[PDB]
């Protein structure tokens, strides 16, 4: 995925385009959380997302943060309702 490819699409479609490339990677890392974690990351600036697509360590760091945030959110909500 290139910046020129992205530049060719409207903003919501740019997010889909990035998501289609990120998803198989994020899914490999966390199959059960794949769509949610991808959605969380897609809120980030596109320039940073392009960077993450080319930098496995950057993607791993961000995914680790998203997983921690998602799991803490879900567990906190469960604890409050339990």
């Amino acid at each position: 995925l290139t910046a020129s490819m992205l530049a060719s699409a409207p903003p919501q479609e740019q997010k889909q385009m990035l998501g289609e490339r990120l998803f198989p990677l994020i899914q490999a890392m966390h199959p059960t959380l794949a769509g949610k974690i991808t959605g969380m990351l897609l809120e980030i600036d596109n320039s940073e997302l392009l960077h993450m697509l080319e930098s496995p360590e950057s993607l791993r760091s961000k995914v680790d943060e998203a997983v921690a945030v998602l799991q803490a959110h879900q567990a906190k909500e469960a604890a409050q309702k339990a």
Partner: peptide, 11 residues
């Protein structure tokens, strides 16, 4: 990061 973000659906 927003844990209430919309689920991404591959299409």
């Amino acid at each position: 990061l927003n844990p209430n973000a919309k689920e991404f659906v591959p299409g």
